[PDB]
Copies of this chain bind each other. A is one copy, B any other.
Amino acid sequence: AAKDVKFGADARALMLQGVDLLADAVAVTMGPKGRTVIIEQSWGSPKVTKDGVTVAKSIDLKDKYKNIGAKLIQDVANNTNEEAGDGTTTATVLARSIAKEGFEKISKGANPVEIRRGVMLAVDAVIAELKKQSKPVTTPEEIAQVATISANGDKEIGNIISDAMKKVGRKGVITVKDGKTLNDELEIIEGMKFDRGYISPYFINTSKGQKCEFQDAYVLLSEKKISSIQSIVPALEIANAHRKPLVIIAEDVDGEALSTLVLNRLKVGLQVVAVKAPGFGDNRKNQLKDMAIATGGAVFGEEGLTLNLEDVQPHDLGKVGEVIVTKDDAMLLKGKGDKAQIEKRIQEIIEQLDVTTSEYEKEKLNERLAKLSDGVAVLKVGGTSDVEVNEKKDRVTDALNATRAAVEEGIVLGGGCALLRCIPALDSLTPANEDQKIGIEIIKRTLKIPAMTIAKNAGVEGSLIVEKIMQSSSEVGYDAMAGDFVNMVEKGIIDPTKVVRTALLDAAGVASLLTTAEVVVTEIPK
């Protein structure tokens, strides 16, 4: 493919146009009063949504240089904010204005690097202030209040979340399922969780939410790589002989092993998924052994006693009641196994904790201890019929994720005020020269945009609302639902600090790249 190369301002100006269309398209859905976007679909009715992420993913421009401006934001704002849809819109709106103000100052003669440095300095001063203003959420009473708020007044949802948090801990594991009954209930089961997801999208099942879930599955554990290695078939034969799903845990999967596994999933209907091993080095080996004990299988290693994948017997694969694999996450619930062997392994880990003094080893040993001795909390959602249970299910998972975020980093005044109230933090920030001063002023002004954007979608003058907040006491913000100026703490209108802080960093990150890149290379279409 032949290329067309643009330089300097000629390329930057086009990328910025791609960004403005995208930012305007998603800014409109921002806040309690966001408006709808109608997205044409090729097979059915138009899709009508208020979701900032859906709208952002839907837009794809035809011009080759404007397409880049749109992707530089979409590939960051949509990918780094997978937990909730709040951070994507905020990061897109701030990135657009930071980059635009930078571009204008640069095309008039300011130095691109010195402007970038002034912006970095301002972003760090603001973040330090957010950390200082953030309040912790660790007390069961505080957790319940946040859960009730993120549950939008549904106290019953807030209560089952608070109760699950109390029973397995602030750092424990809580999941949500359909209870097939009328009432909501909490049960604790045996299981383990590790940070490794599916190796490939080809194994997605139950596609709503991009999940991969199987029951009564075989568990194959390997220390060795199976990339371009076959002889995985005896495990597949057992899975076919005894109609059970199969999950493969391996250091890596590629080549022929991947080809075999995916083609069977697609052409045979074999319910098989592969996931990467949970650790590194020696710790990887120890985690696979704990898993084998917990699932009643064997580890196909080469050191000591050698067990090869070329010969897999029914007693070498483990058995798991329920297995869940999602992007970058996997769980094995209700495993089968010898309880004496599980307790023995637990006791060995405890002895190692009592003996070692290194921080590294104590932490790794504590993770392995917990994976065998702790349970998993399960929140069962009930209701009259499945069409209603299925909606309540999401209200519970949203309240739960918001609760966990609040607990991990604390909470700040929401509705755009967390950043608006950090503007004074820049008054003591001193630049080395005029271009750094301009860079600080660029952030000083973009800190006011979230507040004005929400007021604008609400239907009131953005300028007056944001100025009135700035001129009043710190606890007062503007409530777009109430149409007034209220005490935000008393009303319970809060945003996790984690989200506010990340959206600011993501915006600064993309805008920085976008205003200093000098050469842009695109393909010539045919």
Residues on A lying within 8 angstroms of B by beta carbon are 1-3, 5, 7, 11, 21, 24-25, 28, 33, 35-40, 42, 45-46, 48, 55, 58-62, 64, 67-68, 71-72, 75, 111-114, 180-182, 228, 255-256, 269, 271, 280-282, 360, 384-386, 459, 513, 516-524
Contact = CB atoms under 8 A, between A and B. Distances in A.
Given A28-B519, A280-B385, 16 more contacts: A2-B60, A3-B59, A3-B61, A25-B519, A25-B521, A36-B516, A36-B519, A37-B520, A42-B523, A45-B71, A46-B71, A46-B72, A59-B521, A112-B459, A280-B384, A280-B386
B280 A521 contact: no
Contacts of A24: 7
A235 to B, nearest CB: 18
B21 A523 contact: no
Contact of A36 (B45, B67, B518): B518
A517 B61 CA distance: 21
Which one of A5, A255, A271 has the greatest number of beta carbons of chain B within 10 Å? A5
Given A59-B5, A271-B228, A68 B48 contact: no
Nearest to A63: B2
B40 A68 contact: yes
A346 to B, nearest CB: 24
6 contacts: A36-B516, A40-B68, A40-B521, A40-B522, A48-B513, A360-B384
Contacts of A21: 5
Interface centre among A48, A68, A281 (most CB of B within 10 A): A281
Contact of A1 (B60, B68, B360, B516): B60
Contacts of A282: 181
Contacts of A40: 64, 67-68, 520-523
Given A37-B519, A68-B38, A280-B386, A182 B360 contact: yes
A228 B64 contact: no
A58 B58 CA distance: 29
Contacts of A181: 281-282
Nearest to A279: B385
A522 B42 CA distance: 10
Contacts of A1: 42, 60
A11 B61 CA distance: 18
Given A5-B21, A360-B182, A35 B516 contact: yes
A518 B37 contact: yes
A11 B7 CA distance: 25
Contact of A517 (B33, B36, B113): B36
Contacts of A519: 25, 28, 35-38, 55
A157 B45 CA distance: 40
Nearest to A516: B35
B61 A518 contact: no
A50 to B, nearest CB: 10
A28 B518 contact: yes
B3 A58 contact: yes
Contacts of A523: 40, 42
The 6 closest A-B CB pairs, nearest first, are: A2-B62, A45-B75, A35-B518, A37-B519, A40-B522, A280-B385
B386 A35 contact: no
A42 B64 CA distance: 11
Nearest to A33: B113
A415 B281 CA distance: 41
Contacts of A37: 517-521
A495 B516 CA distance: 27
